[PDB]
Structures are given as structure tokens and as C-alpha cells.
Amino acid sequence: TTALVCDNGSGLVKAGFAGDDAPRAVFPSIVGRPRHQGVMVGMGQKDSYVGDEAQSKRGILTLKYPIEHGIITNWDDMEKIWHHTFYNELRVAPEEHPTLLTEAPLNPKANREKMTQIMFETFNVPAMYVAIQAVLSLYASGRTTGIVLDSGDGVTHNVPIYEGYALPHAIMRLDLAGRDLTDYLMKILTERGYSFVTTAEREIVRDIKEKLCYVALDFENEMATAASSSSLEKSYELPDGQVITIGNERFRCPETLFQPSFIGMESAGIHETTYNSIMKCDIDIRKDLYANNVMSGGTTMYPGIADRMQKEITALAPSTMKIKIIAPPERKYSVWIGGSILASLSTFQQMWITKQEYDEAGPSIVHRKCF
Amino acid sequence: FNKDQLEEFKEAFELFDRVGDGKILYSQCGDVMRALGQNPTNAEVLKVLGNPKSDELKSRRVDFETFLPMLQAVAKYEDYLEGFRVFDGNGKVMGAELRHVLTTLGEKMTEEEVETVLAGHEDSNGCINYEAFLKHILS
Amino acid sequence: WXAXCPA
Amino acid sequence: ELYTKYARVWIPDPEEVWKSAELLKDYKPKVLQLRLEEGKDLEYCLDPLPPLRNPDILVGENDLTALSYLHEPAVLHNLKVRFIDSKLIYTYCGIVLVAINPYEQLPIYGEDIINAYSGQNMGDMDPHIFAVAEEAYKQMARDERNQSIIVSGESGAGKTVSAKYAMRYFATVSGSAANVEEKVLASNPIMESIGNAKTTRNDNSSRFGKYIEIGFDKRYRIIGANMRTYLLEKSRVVFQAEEERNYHIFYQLCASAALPEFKTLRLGNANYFHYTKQGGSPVIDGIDDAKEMVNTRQACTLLGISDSYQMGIFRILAGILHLGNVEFASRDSDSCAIPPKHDPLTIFCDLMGVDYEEMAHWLCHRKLATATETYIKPISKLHAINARDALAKHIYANLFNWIVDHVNKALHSTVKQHSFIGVLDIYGFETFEINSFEQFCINYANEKLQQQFNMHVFKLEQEEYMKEQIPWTLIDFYDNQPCINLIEAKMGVLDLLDEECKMPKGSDDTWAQKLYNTHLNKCALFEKPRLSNKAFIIKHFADKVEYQCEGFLEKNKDTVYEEQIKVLKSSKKFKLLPELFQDSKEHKKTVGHQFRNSLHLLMETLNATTPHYVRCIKPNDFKFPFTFDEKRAVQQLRACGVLETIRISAAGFPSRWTYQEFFSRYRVLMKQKDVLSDRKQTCKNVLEKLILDKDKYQFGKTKIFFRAGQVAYLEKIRADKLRAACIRIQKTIRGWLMRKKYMRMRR
Ligand SMILES: Nc1ncnc2c1ncn2[C@@H]1O[C@H](COP(=O)(O)OP(=O)(O)O)[C@@H](O)[C@H]1O
Ligand SMILES: [Mg+2]
């Protein structure tokens, strides 16, 4: 028997079997409904669409994400995503073998309970576990001492880990993510007189951000350079074949992680939260945390973000500390690679919450047995 | 023992004196007891002698007076038959087997002693009537 | 969430 | 208690483990006076008891279950006398034939003797290997379930000789002419050269199980033979301890580096290659490696491997050797490079016919791919090294399987196989001063096999009890499953090894801490040495064996990056190399998991079949013929499991006697007032007097079964009674003759 691993994002869901090295199923965790009157009759069309369906047909649809900021906002949509995951794409009977689920730290307590309840009652999974995303990235990157900057859609967080001990008081969560970069990118795009007003082109803005955006190694000199000449401008075809051309704006969007004042967010950027998370640790371990500083999740994929991170923490690190950034190319998948290897450890097999224990205890078992 | 018995026993003891001093050797004590009708084991003889060591057993000489308590101490049929029936149940015993056991087990005797006692008692097949041999050796 | 934010 | 004058007992002696001592005076409830060759009185002193010796009637009988006291000294003495004083080389311990290596050539295998043994019942004759083979052959004919013969010992012990003669017997009694024996015998030099190794303690150690199926038609003519192999020690290819070597063939090549044929291989001496050099032991004295190569090639040519394929084999092996020398510079913590024009890689690529620019890239990077996209990721120098060594082990294992498939291609025969008889050659149990993963595997295989041997003997001695109506409850089973559950099962010592193979920054230090945390005071067969936090002890069926964890992960790790196999599969220069990889998770599986599966395949093969066992013993380290070193033979008897088998047997009813033979022997004890017309009720009354309790023996329909010891007690009372009767007779004769001599002095 083999466990299922499904890393559940806030825009993208990644699933497969344990001991696989890359997930078999990846699709956007997106649900769509038709917003129009039908003309034809005898078409046999179906009510609502999931994932690559709702990507393909998006111009006909309205698209909703059931997860925002790592909180499952509507269970009645999410259950469709899981039903598509297990039955349609994987071709698996989830009643046969256990499942592992991944979650951002410090999110609402009820989220775990209700996800457990749905797993045991609806899917009848034989055993279940949930793991903090930032832990798995250390399994994936091969380390036992780490500080982890994990960002996707919905959530960013830092979690320090030293030789297999977490440091709960030092967890930093920060609600800034690719969705908030995208919403800001729409407004900055409007400055050049392109206007994107509904979800079906929000899905285009996301792709523009993915291909074209990049992080200035120092912002204001390059801001001046791009104002001074068109050399940094680059262009993109919309679906209709309109070329659109974008300049200083393409670095200006992914910067805002480092200056959340642009979004009107109160907190400091990811560099200052990473530093404060280290400094909340005690001094015996800080020297080792400075070397084991690990990028994870898709929002870290922007070119330059490692160099900008290394420079901007170096300016805060005491100069003897040779701080080092680890940014492997897989890292968009690293959380899943970690859940894959964790679920395959023999030592883990004790750890699962079995249905016997759930029926004995009810959903509150999760807080007790899990992290 | 009465005076007559003591006289006959003393005379017999003196017959075993090969040196003329009126004494026998320890090694003759057994000979005197058996010649006088006792059938002690070697263990009983050594016990009544006090388990002497080799040197005094072979060269220390004792007179009749010291022998007498020993004779007294040593002095104070169906089993014999069953013992012979051990080596049979047609009433015979191989001459080879009796020779082997008497010269190789227990307090081993010489082949010549066994030939001497067995002389004339075995037939042409080499079988001994043990009841007749027993009566002969008990007479 | 339930308070300080849309979720 | 009952130790008395003229008892015999064994002194434990350092020089030759047991020496015979006679009890000089009776025991009473701490010091014994004893009589010895070193002195008529020598004294022996007793811990807060001496092993009592068997009676003279029992010693030297052909079957070590016959004896009444079952001891290391008694077994050793029986085998010693039978071998030395009678030059008899075969003995039975029950089912097990024990063969003591004569190490001198002998006439005992002649055709007159084959005729003498053929058609017999086994229980009639004196033990001989033909008496095993005939019991197999007849059971194969008498019932459908076919038969297998399991030969176990050290390689010196004579497994080759006993297989040779087993096949000779099968062929001759079948009356088959053809070419089947000679090819199997001629196969052995290649199977050694690829499969046989020099361990620290033993030369020509065999590091795999070799299985030969002699196939029979519906008429029980020999059709042909089929070879299989199992349990191959893949890790020896790339790591060896002090004064080991890897497989002989690499040294047979390096010795042959001078020949014009091999000039293209650019070989060196065996100190030149990282895989050969590590042991520090290039030369075995007395071996003519240069000619042993020729003795290999002759066997290849007799089987039918073309000279083209032979040059393919030897060029792949030179490939492996040159691959081993490729050396990685660390570029970073998590990056490496092969240096420019690196000479070993240049030679490897020229031998194998692949693009240097691809091998240099793929040896230093791994491909990650998913249905959407693919990433190339660099790997640490350690990972690159481990992947190179796993590639080398994968090539070698495939080459071995290929040569064994061509051997079968030669030996296979057209006719449909009605049934077959197996001859299994497998290494014996192994233990050394410094003890390591290789022995942990060898001992796991021996535990697995000994569980079968216990099933087998237990089932047969449920049958033999039913045949006599004796209650099964008296026989009780002795189980080694609690050890096999410790080694194989989940959270077992292998499973925690494989789990740390992948756990991040796993190490030999942490692995032992996991062992201690999981088993230390939880499972009574696992123990820790006082002085060390790096080692552990498993109480096997035979022994406590101490294993040391250094290098115990690194030997376990095998993983192969598929893109390197794909590159070698895309080679175009020569034909064989694409042939090796004809047909994933096999690339993921560790050496330990591959071994545990190979052993499951072996056990599923043997469990299909009715086993018969042979054990083979090496009497001395120095190759002296017809000498028997008790210090060596005791270690060999423990290592063959024979002493533990006997120790199990002594728990039940070792000694078994037919009522008529019992009556015949012990009538000397029997009062003719008692003795009936009917033997059986006579014996049943006599014995009830002679033994304290019924439970100490049993009455069957046709046989009496005694526990250990008690037949020597009956011999004691027989000897004491008979000697007392001799005392009475002899004192009567002595007294009568002395009395006569007195009358003779009167006369
Ligand atoms: N190659 C890329 N470059 C820039 N942004 C990306 C890239 N890939 C994904 N993203 C953005 O990051 C988010 C998805 O990242 P992901 O790690 O899958 O989040 P999660 O796994 O939590 O759903 C989306 O906002 C997406 O637009
Ligand atoms: Mg994520």
C-alpha cells in the first residue's frame, strides 16, 4: 500500500503517490460556473468545471478560487476539487490507501478539523495526516537545520528549524502572495492604458507576471534607468494577438514583496521578517540559520530574488556571518517532494491518524496527534 | 576359634613363611586366608590390611598375631548360579568369552590362571557346563 | 478568516 | 547426580577443546580427583558440572542421534574417530548428512558402490552421498513433489566434489549417457571468476547461491540442466575491507594486461584502479592468475561464448575499472565538475562508445521531470560518487545475469521437463573479528533457511510419531521466527537502514541510535555492547554476532540515475552493451531490498520442493590430509548449525530402539522369573523397574523411545551388574587356585 500526497496550494494543487519524484497531477485549484444563457439544445453541457476544464473554457465562465490565504473559504467547492483529484485525474479509490495533506502554519484551528471530517466521512480515507508546508521543504532540500521562506498563492511564512526542532514562537506569517502581486499588477498595468477587470483576464495577468516580471538587484537605479530608456521594455501577445509592451512596471510589480507599503500593507518585507525570525532565535543557532537559508514555493521563482535576498539580509547580518541562500530550481515542487519522502519513511507509519482513532476521538484528534 | 583351630591356622601360617622368621608378607595374607577357606575380594583384603602403600605391602613382614585380627575381620548359592547364568540359556558358556571377561574385566586375572581353572571343563565345541564347573570349584 | 481580513 | 568411580568425563582444555578424563573417586555434594594421560592423579575444580561421556557401545556408530549424551565433545569425538581411525568421511545427524572433507582422493565413488547404493533403502546402508541422492531420486518417483539437495558449508569444504558426485550418481542410475555432467562441471571456472571472491579469512569464498536443476523426462532420463543464481553480493564490486579482494575476474584481467588482445583496454596493475586497490592485497600467493585467465577462456569456449562476446565481456569489465577511476572536483557544496580531458573518463567513453560531452554532463547532473516540464538539477560530489558506484554495481549485476543466461542457453535441452532435482550450493553461516553488512546478509539468509530446516524436521518427526502412535504433544517446536521478525519485518534492522538511506543527513551514527531506541530493551534478541555506541549484537540461532555500523549505510545505498543507463543503452560501437539492458523501481531499490527480494525468490523456489540437506566441514586451516583439528572443526560444526540442531534434538527422544534389539541387549538385566513368552510386555515390565518415571521414555508400537541420557544409564547398570558378577566369579577362582597352590605346597 502507498500513501497519496496532495500538496494543496491556494491557486494550484499538486498530487501524486508517495515515492514518486514529481507529482502526476497538477492543475489550478479553480472552480468555474457558466455566466450565460445557453442557445443550443441537446448540447448535454455540464453544470460546472474544475481545473484544466475551467482554464480551457474560461471566457464562457466565471472563476472562483475556493482557497484564499491558505483558508478553505467554501468547502462545497473544495470537495469538488478533491473529488476531481482522486477519481478523475489520479484514477484512485481513496478508500484503499492513506493520504497526506499540507497546510500553512498558524491558520484557523477549525480548518484542520473540517478537512479531517470531510476526509473520513466523505472519502473514507483509511488514514490521514497534515503537515506544515515549511517542514517539508527541509526534507526536500536534504537538511535538518533550516530557516525557510515559503511563498505561493495566499500565504508567505518563515519557520525556523534547527536539528529537527521547530521554534513555534519564531514562526512569522505574512499574507502577501502571487495573488496580491497580480491584483497590484492589474492596477499598475492600468497606468499604461490596458484594463483588466474580470477573473478571466486575471488569469492572463497571472501569465504576464509569470513570464515577464523580475526583481531589480537595486530598485531605484533601475527605476531611473528604465525611465531613461526603453531598453528594459518587453512585449507580450494577448490571446487576440494584441501586442502589449511593458517597462519599469514589470520589475515594479514583484518588488512589492520587499516594500509592502506599495500595496498599503503595514508590515515590513520578507527580508525584515526573515531577519526578525532569526533574531527571535537564541544566539547559539543563529550562525547556523544564516547558512541554511532556503527559498521555497513559486512566488520565489522570480529571477533575481535570491540575489536581492542575499544582498538585503547581508546589509542586516553582522558582517562576519557569511550568509548563504539556497534556491534550487525544483523549489516550486519542493513542498511536494518533501511530502513524498516523508510519507515514505517507515518511521512515519506509526504517525498516521487511523479511522479507528478518529471514530474513537472525533475531529479534535488532529490538534492532539498532529503538530 | 579354639586351641585346635588356632594351632592348625598357626601351622598353616608358618607354612607360608619363606624366610624362617615365623612371618609372612602382606602379599601372602590373601593366600593364607583363601587357603584356609575364605573368599575375600582384593578390596576386602586391602581394607583389613589398612590399605598399605606399595613399599610396606611388598617388604614389611608381619607375624601370625597381627594376621589373626585380619582373618577374623575377613571371616565376619543361588546368586552364584545366576552369576554364571549371566554369560549363557542352554547351560553353556563360550571359553573365549569367559577367558576375555576374566582377563579383561573386574580384578583382571591372568590367562594362565583361567586356563588352569578351566582345564578339563570345556568340551570339543568349546562350551562349559557352568553348574558342573561351579560345583567343582565350590567343593 | 473571520475578522481582520476578507477570509 | 550419580557420578561414580570409573565414570568418564571431559575436561575443558584450551589446546584441543575437550580431553577425556576418568573419574578417580566418587562424587558427593567441589573438587574431583581425576586420572589422565598427563598423570594418574590430576585434580579438577568446579564452578558454582563435567560433561558425562557416552558408553563405548555407542561411540563410532554411523548416526549421531544414536548417542545417549549429546555434547560438543561427544559429537566432535565421534566425527574425529570415524575420520581419523577409520578414514570414513560421512555421518548422519538425523536427516542431515555430514561430510567431513577428506582432502585426499579416494575410491569410495566407484561404480561398484553406485550399484551397491542404488535401489536400497537409505536407512539400511552406511551413510554416503549416494544414499542421499537415491532417497531424493526415489521420493521424486514415488510421489509427484520433486526434490532438492541443499549443500552448505565453507567453499573449502568440498561442495564442488559433492555436487560432481551427486550428478554422476543421477546420470549413472538413470542410465543416461548425455553431455550433461561434463558441461556443468566445465562451467565452474567462469562462475567462479565472475562470482567467487577472496575474503579475509577464506580464499575462494563463493559470494552467491548457485542452483542447478537437473531435469528429468517422463521416463527419468536426464534431459539437461538449468542454472539459476541468487543472493549475489553486489557491494563487494566497489568496497572491500583490509586484505579482501573483489571478484577474481578483475585481477585476472589486470594480470593479463600485457597480451596484445588487451592493449586496447589500456589496463594497469591492480593497484592502479580504485576498485581493486582498496584491499591492499593484489596478489594471492600460489595462484597463477595469468593461466587462470586461460582456464576461464577455455570454459567460455567449451560452453560456446564466441570470442567476440568474450572480448565484449572483458571490455565492459575494463570499462567498469576505468569508470571507477573518474574523480570529481567539488565546484560548490551542491555542485561538482569532472575536470577537463579527464583521462579515466576519456578511456571509459572510448571503450564504451558514448559521447564524452554527454557522460560528463549526466554523471554530474540529475534530470527531474514532470508531465508539464523538466528541470535539470546539480548534485553534491557525494551523490555523484554514490551514483557512479551504483552504475558500476548495476553494470556488473547485469553482466553476471547475462553470462548465466548464456550458460543456460548452452545447457538448455529441447525435451519437456517432467520434473527436476535441485542441487543448491549456498555459503554457510559467517562470522569474523570485524563484522559488516556482507555477513549481515549472509546470516539473514542462513536464518531464513534454518527456519525451513526446522519446519522440515518438525514435520517429519510429527510423521514418525504418528507412525508409532506416540502423542504429538511430547514433541515441541523450537522457533527462530522471533529473530527473522527482528531482521526482516517493518521497523526491523533492514527497514531502519533503508529508511535512513533517504532521510536527510542520515548517517551511521544516527542509524544505531534509531536501532537502540527501537529495539534495545524491547526485543530480547537485540543487544548492545557495553563499550560502544556504534555496534549491536544479534543473538542468532548459532551465536551472538556483533556487527559494526561504520560504512553500513554506504554499502546499502544503490540508486541509479536513469539517464546514465539511457546513455549507455544508446551506445553504438558494440553489440553486447545494449544487450545487457534488455527488459524504474529496480533503479530505486537499495541493495538490502534487492537482497530481501532475491531471498524471497529463493525461498519460494525451495518451498515448492522437498528438501534434503548436506553439511560440509573443513578439518583444518593448513590443507593437511586426514588430520582433524578440534579447534577448527568445532567452529565449523557450530557454523554449520549442526551443534544447535543436535542441541534441539536432545530436547526430545534422540535414542530409539526396536523391542527385539532392546530385549537382546538387556536380557542380562532381566530376571527369568519375570520374562514372558511375549517380548513386548516383558520389556514394558522390565523397563518400568529400571527407570524412575514413565515420562522419561515412551512405548510405541514397534520401537522404544528414550530421552537423552537414559540409554547410558542402562549401560551403566548393565556394566555394574555384570562386573559385580565378574567380581564374584574371579574371587572364587582366585581363592580356589591359591587354595590349590597351598595344597600343592603340602603336595
Ligand atoms: N515561474 C513563475 N514565475 C513567477 N510566478 C509564478 C511562477 N510560477 C507560479 N507563479 C505564481 O505563484 C503562485 C503559484 O505558486 P505555488 O507555489 O503553486 O503556490 P501554491 O503551491 O501555494 O498554490 C501563482 O500566483 C503563480 O502566478
Ligand atoms: Mg505551497
Per-residue b/e over B53-81, b at no fewer than 16 CB within 10 Å?
Answer: eeeeeeeeebebeebeebbeebeeeeebe
Cβ-based burial of D476 (10 A; exposed 0-12, middle 13-18, buried ≥19): exposed
Tell which one of A10, A209, A251, A295 to mutate to probe ligand 1, the residue whose CB is within 8 A of the most ligand atoms. Answer: A209
Q: Which residues contact D598 (CB under 8 A, 6 or more apart)?
A: D230, D231, D232
Q: What's the length of chain B?
A: 139
And the C-alpha cell for D73?
565433545
The minimum-distance atom of ligand 1 relative to the CA of A7 is 21
Cell 499540507 maps to which residue? A102
Q: How far is CA D33 from CA A153, B54, D16, D27, D38, in A?
A: 91, 20, 21, 10, 13
And the C-alpha cell for D492?
526491523
Cell 514413565 maps to which residue? D694
Contact D708, D655 (CB under 8 A): yes
Cell 558582517 maps to which residue? A319
Nearest CA to ligand 1 atom 25: A178
Contact A307, A295 (CB under 8 A): no
D235 SS3 class:
helix
And the C-alpha cell for A99?
493520504
How many whole angstroms separate alpha carbon A81 and alpha carbon A86?
9
Q: Do D368 and A24 touch (CB under 8 A)?
A: no
Cell 570470442 maps to which residue? D307
CATH architecture of A28-68: Roll (2.30)
Contacts of C4 in chain A (CB under 8 A): none
Q: Which residues contact A183 (CB under 8 A, 6 or more apart)?
A: A202
Greatest Cα pair distance, chain A, in angstroms, is 74
Q: Tell me A168's DSSP state.
A: G
Beta strand A146-151 with A172-174 is unpaired
- Tell me the fold of A182-270: Actin; Chain A, domain 4 (3.90.640)
Method of determination used here: cryo-EM
Cβ-based burial of D489 (10 A; exposed 0-12, middle 13-18, buried ≥19): exposed
Cβ-based burial of D169 (10 A; exposed 0-12, middle 13-18, buried ≥19): buried
Contact D265, D351 (CB under 8 A): yes
- Please choose, from the candidates A189, D731, A209, the residue with its C-alpha nearest in 3D space to the C-alpha of residue B102: D731
Nearest CA to ligand 1 atom 9: A298
Q: Which residues contact D612 (CB under 8 A, 6 or more apart)?
A: D95, D132, D135, D136, D147, D148, D149, D150
- Please choose, from the candidates D266, D209, D276, the residue with its C-alpha nearest in 3D space to the C-alpha of residue D246: D276
And the C-alpha cell for B40?
575375600
Q: Which amino acid is at B24?
A: I
And the C-alpha cell for D101?
572433507
Cβ-based burial of A98 (10 A; exposed 0-12, middle 13-18, buried ≥19): buried
In what order do the strands lie in the sheet containing A31-34? A49-50, A31-34, A61-64
How many whole angstroms separate alpha carbon D250 and alpha carbon D263?
16
Q: Do B109 and D723 touch (CB under 8 A)?
A: no
Q: Tell me D612's DSSP state.
A: E
Q: What single string gives the DSSP state of each residue in D702-740?
A: SEEEE-TTHHHHHHHHHHHHHHHHHHHHHHHHHHHHHHH
Q: How far is CA D121 from CA D134, D188, D219, D605, in A?
A: 8, 32, 21, 27
B121 SS3 class:
coil
Cell 558441461 maps to which residue? D183
And the C-alpha cell for D94?
538425523
Contacts of D377 in chain A (CB under 8 A): 328-330
Contact yes or no, C with A (3+ CB pairs under 8 Å): yes
Cell 547581508 maps to which residue? A314
Contact D65, D654 (CB under 8 A): yes
Cβ-nearest to D730 among B30, B82, B106: B106
Tell me how far the alpha carbon of residue A118 is from its chain's centroid.
Answer: 22
Which residues sit opposite D421 in a β-bridge? D147, D214
Q: Do A68 and C7 touch (CB under 8 A)?
A: yes
- Please choose, from the candidates D82, D116, D111, the residue with its C-alpha nearest in 3D space to the C-alpha of residue D99: D82
* Centroid of ligand 1 to alpha carbon of A245 (angstroms): 22
Residues of D with CB under 8 A from a CB of B: 668, 672, 722-723, 725-739, 741-743, 745-746
Contact A332, A140 (CB under 8 A): no
How many whole angstroms separate alpha carbon A137 and alpha carbon A156?
14
Contacts of B106 in chain D (CB under 8 A): 723, 726-727, 730
- Please choose, from the candidates A174, A167, A152, the residue with its C-alpha nearest in 3D space to the C-alpha of residue A272: A174
Compute the Cα dihedral for B89, B94, B95, B100 and give only its sign: negative
For D84, left (φ over 0), alpha (ψ -120 to 50), or beta? alpha
Tell me how far the alpha carbon of residue D191 is from its chain's centroid.
Answer: 18
- Please choose, from the candidates D276, D560, D158, D239, the residue with its C-alpha nearest in 3D space to the C-alpha of residue D390: D560
Contact A107, C5 (CB under 8 A): no
And the C-alpha cell for D351?
571503450
For D551, left (φ over 0), alpha (ψ -120 to 50), or beta? left
Q: Which residues contact D260 (CB under 8 A, 6 or more apart)?
A: none
How many whole angstroms separate alpha carbon B10 and alpha carbon B4?
10
**In Å, how far is D369's CA from the nearest CA of chain A?**
7
* Helices (H), ranges, D118-176: 129-142, 159-174
Q: What is the resolution of this structure in A?
A: 3.5
Give the alpha-carbon dihedral of B127, B131, B133, B134, to 10 degrees. 140
**In Å, how far is D666's CA from the nearest CA of chain B?**
11
- Please choose, from the candidates B89, B94, B29, B93, the residue with its C-alpha nearest in 3D space to the C-alpha of residue B57: B29
Tell which one of A301, A305, A334 to mutate to probe ligand 1, the residue whose CB is within 8 A of the most ligand atoms. Answer: A301
Q: Do C6 and A68 touch (CB under 8 A)?
A: yes
Lining ligand 1 with CB less than 6 A are A 9-12, 152-153, 178-179, 206, 209-210, 297-299, 301-302, 332
CB contacts < 8 A (B, D):
74
Cβ-nearest to B86 among D725, D734, D741: D725
Q: How far is CA D101 from CA D81, D202, D393, in A?
A: 14, 16, 35
How many whole angstroms separate alpha carbon D236 and alpha carbon D240?
6
How many whole angstroms separate alpha carbon D411 and alpha carbon D409?
6
Residues of D recognised as catalytic: 155-156, 160, 202, 205-206, 428, 430
* Helices (H), ranges, D40-158: 72-84, 111-117, 129-142
Listed in order, strand segments (DSSP E) in D232-299 are none
Q: Which amino acid is at B21?
A: D
Tally of CA atoms within 13 A in the half-sphere of A213 that contains its CB = 27
Q: Which amino acid is at D4?
A: T
- Please choose, from the candidates D425, D420, D358, the residue with its C-alpha nearest in 3D space to the C-alpha of residue D150: D425
Q: SS3 string of D503-545? A: CCCCCHHHHHHHHHHHHCCCCCCEECCCCCCCEEEEECCCCEE
Mutate to test the interface with A, among D383, D498, D503 (most CBs of A within 10 A): D503
- Please choose, from the candidates A270, A245, A262, A258, the residue with its C-alpha nearest in 3D space to the C-alpha of residue A184: A262
Number of Cβ within a 10 Å radius of residue D45: 7
Contact yes or no, D with A (3+ CB pairs under 8 Å): yes
**In Å, how far is B12's CA from the nearest CA of chain D?**
9
Q: Which residues contact A64 (CB under 8 A, 6 or more apart)?
A: A30, A31, A32, A33, A74, A77, A199
The minimum-distance atom of ligand 1 relative to the CA of A70 is 22
Contacts of D745 in chain B (CB under 8 A): 15
Tell me how far the alpha carbon of residue A185 is from its chain's centroid.
Answer: 18
- Please choose, from the candidates D314, D324, D306, D303, the residue with its C-alpha nearest in 3D space to the C-alpha of residue D249: D314
* Helices (H), ranges, D524-626: 552-556, 562-569, 576-580, 585-588, 591-606
Q: Do A68 and C2 touch (CB under 8 A)?
A: no
Q: Which amino acid is at D243?
A: E
How many whole angstroms separate alpha carbon A339 and alpha carbon A344?
9
Q: Which residues contact D60 (CB under 8 A, 6 or more apart)?
A: D78, D81, D82, D86
Which residues sit opposite D8 in a β-bridge? D22
**In Å, how far is D608's CA from the nearest CA of chain A?**
27
- Please choose, from the candidates A365, A305, A371, the residue with its C-alpha nearest in 3D space to the C-alpha of residue A135: A371
- Tell me the fold of A135-181+271-333: Nucleotidyltransferase; domain 5 (3.30.420)
CA angle A106, A107, A112 (to 5 degrees): 110
Number of Cβ within a 10 Å radius of residue D377: 12
And the C-alpha cell for D316?
565492459
And the C-alpha cell for D80?
574425529
Contact D739, D747 (CB under 8 A): no
The answer to whether A1-27+69-134+334-367 and A135-181+271-333 have equal CATH topology is: yes
Q: Which amino acid is at D354?
A: V
Contact A123, A94 (CB under 8 A): yes
Mutate to test the interface with B, among D675, D718, D734 (most CBs of B within 10 A): D734
Contacts of C5 in chain A (CB under 8 A): 69, 175
Nearest CA to ligand 1 atom 3: A210
How many whole angstroms separate alpha carbon A254 and alpha carbon D431?
64
A204 SS3 class:
helix
Q: Do B31 and D745 touch (CB under 8 A)?
A: no
How many whole angstroms separate alpha carbon A6 and alpha carbon D111?
72
Residues 318-357 of A with CB under 8 A from D: 326, 328-330, 333, 341, 344-347, 349
* Helices (H), ranges, A162-269: 178-190, 199-212, 219-228, 248-255
Tell me how far the alpha carbon of residue A172 is from its chain's centroid.
Answer: 16
Give the alpha-carbon dihedral of A209, A211, A212, A215, to 10 degrees. 80
Q: Is C4 on the interface with A (CB under 8 A)?
A: no
Preceding-residue numbers of gaps in chain B (C–N over 2.5 Å): 76, 88
Contacts of B85 in chain D (CB under 8 A): 672
Radius of gyration of chain D measured on its C-alpha atoms:
31
How many helices (H) and strands (E) are present in chain C, helices listed first? 0, 0
Contact D616, D157 (CB under 8 A): yes
D551 SS3 class:
coil
Chains in contact with C, where contact means 3 or more Cβ–Cβ distances below 8 Å, are A
How many whole angstroms separate alpha carbon D249 and alpha carbon D255?
10
The minimum-distance atom of ligand 1 relative to the CA of A179 is 25
How many whole angstroms separate alpha carbon D272 and alpha carbon D24?
66
Nearest CA to ligand 1 atom 26: A178
Contact yes or no, D with B (3+ CB pairs under 8 Å): yes
Q: Is B105 on the interface with D (CB under 8 A)?
A: yes
Tell me the backbone φ, ψ of residue D707, rounded to 5 degrees: -65, 170
The yes or no reply on domain A1-27+69-134+334-367 and CATH 3.40.190.170 is no
* Centroid of ligand 1 to alpha carbon of A41 (angstroms): 39
Chains in contact with B, where contact means 3 or more Cβ–Cβ distances below 8 Å, are D
Q: Do A108 and C5 touch (CB under 8 A)?
A: no
Q: How far is CA A76 from CA A27, A49, A114, in A?
A: 19, 14, 12
Which residues sit opposite A160 in a β-bridge? A147
**In Å, how far is A195's CA from the nearest CA of chain C?**
24
A79 SS3 class:
helix
Nearest CA to ligand 1 atom 8: A298
Cβ-nearest to D732 among B12, B37, B39: B39
* Centroid of ligand 1 to alpha carbon of A345 (angstroms): 28
Contacts of C6 in chain A (CB under 8 A): 68
* Centroid of ligand 2 to alpha carbon of A156 (angstroms): 9
Contact A107, A154 (CB under 8 A): no
How many whole angstroms separate alpha carbon A89 and alpha carbon A85?
5
- Please choose, from the candidates D660, D659, D614, D620, the residue with its C-alpha nearest in 3D space to the C-alpha of residue D640: D614
Contact D98, D428 (CB under 8 A): no
Nearest CA to ligand 1 atom 20: A9
How many whole angstroms separate alpha carbon A174 and alpha carbon A180?
12
Q: What single string gives the DSSP state of each residue in A96-116?
A: SS-EEEEE-TT--HHHHHHHH
Domain map (residue ranges) of chain A: 1-27+69-134+334-367, 28-68, 135-181+271-333, 182-270
D79 SS3 class:
helix
